[PDB]
């Protein structure tokens, strides 16, 4: 019973420099395994708390090579089936694992699509009871 | 500037407590009965508990003045600031956030609820650029 919400104005600011700056960190690369392997080779372990870069195509298929959590692989697959309009970007909660994206990307001369995901901790809680 | 989106478990407890408000002053056709009798319930200024504000649909903040100045200014700021008045956002003046509006029924007027509540936690905003 999903819920496509809007990203906050500075996550998604975020996202897009990040976008541009693995861009611009890759240009010269040319070979595309190279490239994911590469990023995603930045994280240290499944608990790693760092935001982890998917990836997508343009016909439904994540690409990344097995990562050790394989929750987060399927969130991420569930979000990419699950996108209605791949020009908005918008986020989906599974369980306490934000999922974010799509945003347009250019590796190795292809056109992709990049997201991010990371785990949401739940607010401090406000009451607000009824005893006014 | 940063209108963010209310938690969805604050957004329906603010529902929650509004239809609540609603239903206990039903019998009251007094608006400033009820404005303040809601806002008696708050012991002092240094009170944790969030304090409920209200508006109507003309840019004002009606409320019986009260012994907390900056909420004032930053619940008047927030009214003043809304692009959308049929989506409830949140804004943070410095610990103090600020959500709604919703609307509500009270002494046969439509008004609009808002909730204040200081805010202790400025991260999770854990990020990165080593990639």
Do not use: C
């Not at 600011?13 to 070979?31: F, G, L, P, V």
């Not at 298929?61 to 929750?71: A, E, G, I, P, Y």
């Not at 997201?115 to 901790?121: A, E, I, M, Q, S």
């Amino acid at each position: 019973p999903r819920k496509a919400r809007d990203i906050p104005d500075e996550h998604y600011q975020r996202i897009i420099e990040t976008r541009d700056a693995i861009q611009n960190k890759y240009s010269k690369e040319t070979d595309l395994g190279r490239i994911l392997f590469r990023v995603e080779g930045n994280r240290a372990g499944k608990h790693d708390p760092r935001p982890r870069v998917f990836f997508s195509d343009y016909n439904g298929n994540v690409l990344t090579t097995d990562k050790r959590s394989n929750f987060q692989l399927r969130a991420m697959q569930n979000f990419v089936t699950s996108i209605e309009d791949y020009n908005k970007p918008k986020q989906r909660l599974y369980g306490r694992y934000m999922i974010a994206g799509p945003v347009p990307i250019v590796l190795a001369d292809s056109e992709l699509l990049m997201y991010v995901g990371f785990k949401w901790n739940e607010p401090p809680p406000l009451l607000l009871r009824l005893f006014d």
